[PDB]
């Protein structure tokens, strides 16, 4: 299917390359920038999966309480004939009542944006249900790929949610903070 | 259906973004390096499409007569939550016994690597015959998209080939020479 190929594209063309190198870049960032990403919770790549496929290019537009802080050091690699193709990731603070409640490396899964854009060219389903369904198959396929990639998969976390892009009562920052707090609770020995 | 998604992603996420800006970047390069990307033939983006989907990452190690020259100035954009995602392209000289026989911005169609990998990972359920068929469908889908694009998105040449006495540099040079003839 379409989402099946896009999930393999997302792993083969991105996650396979950047997940093994992520901790080294975070360690380099923390050494030179006063250890902003503290603890395992703040050291994963958090991948946003809006199953609505509404994907803004600026996260601050999706929620004012998500604010850009810095970039990790870039990763370069020779890729399909391009010398030093650049892979870059952005660090955000999550604000709660005007105060920083979290810090994480955060981004959208770009292929969900591709699915939506494809519908704009009348080459993929465009309806609310069709966006949700195509995104679900992509997410489940990506989940299965990562479960079969035990060597590098623990460097990322998937954050999927169904609320519409234009839903004004939905807090993306609160959605991320809920995941981060749950991750920290799993660290307690009980 | 795999190829349909990959080809549209290649257009939506790459070609539609960089082709309208490619001439300006080449012009910037040509202004500081003595119109070395000369003639209309050196102004296009050349995209290698090996139909078996075997895509080396290093072009100079694939054929020593394909020699890295320079990066174009890079192009950046905010993309899906990433600030200043970087788009970069490489210029190469094609040599014959030391003589420059052509110069161009040259690369492989990266999504062919996804088709190849799916044919090697048993979890993907994707055979070599599937790979070869989707590779042809990817090429045809991309050709259709580019044919429907504005003249601002049209400045690229797809070089599709089957490798059976094979020179990759000669494969490119044959297309560059044909274009030079259709100029005059
Ligand atoms: N966050 C994030 N940062 C990244 O740096 C990144 N790189 C990959 N990916 C993800 C894996 C998908 C497939 O990656 P890939 O196998 O390279 O296929 C590309 C390639 F053929 C071409 N292309 C695009 N950009 C470029 C470029 N700079 N240079 C050359 N060619 C370029 O367009 C296709 C579709 O790209 P898209 O962004 O839509 O989907 C990406 C999303 C990324 N994600």
Please identify, by name, the CATH architecture of the largest domain in chain A: 3-Layer(aba) Sandwich
Q: What radius of gyration of chain A results from the CA coordinates?
A: 17 Å
**Would you tell me which CATH topology of the largest domain in chain A applies?**
Rossmann fold
Oligomer: homodimer
Strand content range of chain A? 15-25%
Total discrete domains of chain A: 2
Largest interface: A-B, 48 and 45 residues
Small-molecule binders here are: ligand JLU
CATH class of the largest domain in chain A: Alpha Beta
Principal-axes geometry of chain A comes out as globular
Please give the alpha-carbon distance between the first and last residues of chain A: 43 Å
Total helical elements of chain A: 6
Q: What is the SS-derived class of chain A? A: alpha/beta
The H/E string of chain A reads: HHEHEEEEEHHEH
Helicity level of chain A: 40-55%
- Order of strands across the main sheet of chain A: 2-5-6-1-7
Largest β sheet strand count, sense and barrel closure of chain A: 5 strands, mixed
Give a written overview of the molecule:
Chain A: It is a multi-pass membrane protein. Chain A: Belongs to the STING family. Chain A: It comes from Homo sapiens. The structure is a homodimer. In chain A, 37% of the residues are buried. By secondary structure, chain A is α/β, with parallel strands linked by helices. In chain A, the strands form 2 sheets. Chain A has a 5-stranded mixed beta sheet with strand order 2-5-6-1-7. Chain A is globular and about 50 Å long. The first copy, chain A, contains 6 helices and 7 strands; from the N terminus they run H-H-E-H-E-E-E-E-E-H-H-E-H. In chain A, helix 1 packs across helix 5 (128-147). The longest helix of chain A is centred in the C-terminal third of the chain and has 20 residues, at 128-147. The interface between A and B is large, with 48 and 45 residues. Bound molecules: the ligand Nc1nc(=O)c2ncn([C@@H]3C[C@@H]4COP(=O)(O)O[C@H]5[C@@H](F)[C@H](n6cnc7c(N)ncnc76)O[C@@H]5COP(=O)(O)O[C@H]4C3)c2[nH]1. Ligand JLU sits between chains A (9-10, 13-14, 82, 85, 87, 107, 110-111, 114) and B (9-10, 13-14, 82, 85, 87-88, 110-111, 114).
């Amino acid at each position: 299917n379409v989402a099946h190929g896009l999930a393999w594209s997302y792993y083969i063309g991105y996650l396979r390359l950047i997940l093994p190198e992520l901790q080294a870049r975070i360690r380099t960032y923390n050494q030179h920038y006063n250890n902003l990403l503290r603890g395992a919770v703040s050291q994963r790549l958090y991948i946003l999966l809006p199953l609505d496929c509404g994907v803004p290019d600026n996260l601050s537009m999706a929620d004012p309480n998500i604010r850009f802080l810095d970039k990790l050091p870039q990763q370069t690699g020779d890729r399909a004939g391009i010398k030093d193709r650049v892979y870059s990731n952005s660090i955000y603070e999550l604000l709660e009542n005007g105060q920083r409640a979290g810090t994480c490396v955060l981004e959208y899964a770009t292929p969900l944006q591709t699915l939506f854009a494809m519908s704009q060219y009348s080459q993929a389903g465009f309806s609310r249900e069709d966006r949700l369904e195509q995104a679900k198959l992509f997410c489940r396929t990506l989940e299965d790929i990562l479960a079969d990639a035990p060597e590098s998969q623990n460097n990322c976390r998937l954050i999927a949610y169904q609320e519409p892009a234009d839903d004004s009562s939905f807090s993306l920052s609160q959605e991320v903070l809920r995941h981060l707090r749950q991750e920290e609770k799993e660290e307690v020995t009980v």
